[PDB]
């Protein structure tokens, strides 16, 4: 376990390899740079990925750059955090929340 977490900006092109085929659960943050609530959660996700990096991986999907993946998962409010396991969404958190609330929402993945 480490003091920093990993981060990868995933694309329409990389989504299968990076997310849908991952061993760990992957929290995909569907965001945009003009979204204040997305900016708000970014330190929380950073802290979470460091704290629980043995359990979960955090990646970001910019919806301006990657439409498509957004539209595939019906993402029309941001931030939306989808956690993927086995190539499908297992948990969805829609809208910005405090760190402690995100961690509760992630309990089934990061309690182990």
UniProtKB/Swiss-Prot annotation:
Name the GO terms of the biological process aspect: cell redox homeostasis
- Which GO CC annotations does the UniProt entry carry? cytoplasm; cytosol
Q: What UniProt keywords are attached to this protein's entry?
A: Cytoplasm, Disulfide bond, Electron transport, Redox-active center, Transport
Protein's UniProt keywords contain Cytoplasm: yes
- What intrachain disulfides are recorded? 35-38
What the entry lists under InterPro entries is as follows: Thioredoxin, Thioredoxin-like_sf, Thioredoxin_CS, Thioredoxin_domain
The record's subcellular locations are: Cytoplasm
User: Which factors induce or repress this protein, as stated in its UniProt record?
Assistant: Expressed from 2 promoters, 1 of which (trxBp1) is under control of SigR, and further transiently induced (about 50-fold) by the thiol-oxidizing agent diamide. Part of the trxB-trxA operon.
Q: Where is the Thioredoxin domain?
A: 4-111
Per its UniProt entry, which superkingdom is the organism in? Bacteria
Tell me if Transmembrane is a UniProt keyword of this record: no
Per UniProt, what is one GO molecular function of this protein?
Answer: protein-disulfide reductase activity
Q: Name one Pfam family in it.
A: Thioredoxin
| Stated role | Component of the thioredoxin-thioredoxin reductase system. Participates in various redox reactions through the reversible oxidation of its active center dithiol to a disulfide and catalyzes dithiol-disulfide exchange reactions. Stimulates complex formation between sigma factor SigR and its cognate anti-sigma factor RsrA probably by reducing RsrA.
By sequence similarity, the record places it as follows: Belongs to the thioredoxin family.
Q: What is this protein called?
A: Thioredoxin 1
**Species of the source:** Streptomyces coelicolor (strain ATCC BAA-471 / A3(2) / M145)
């Amino acid at each position: 376990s480490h003091m920093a977490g990993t981060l990868k900006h995933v694309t329409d092109d990389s989504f299968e390899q990076d997310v849908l085929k991952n061993d760990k659960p992957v929290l995909v943050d569907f965001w945009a740079a003009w979204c204040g609530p997305c900016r708000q959660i970014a330190p929380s996700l950073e802290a979470i990925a460091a704290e629980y990096g043995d359990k979960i991986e955090i990646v970001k999907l910019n919806i301006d750059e990657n439409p498509g993946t957004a539209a595939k998962y019906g993402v029309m409010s941001i931030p939306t955090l989808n956690v993927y396991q086995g190539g499908e969404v297992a948990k969805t958190i829609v809208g910005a929340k405090p760190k402690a609330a995100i961690v509760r929402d992630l309990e089934d993945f990061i309690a182990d």
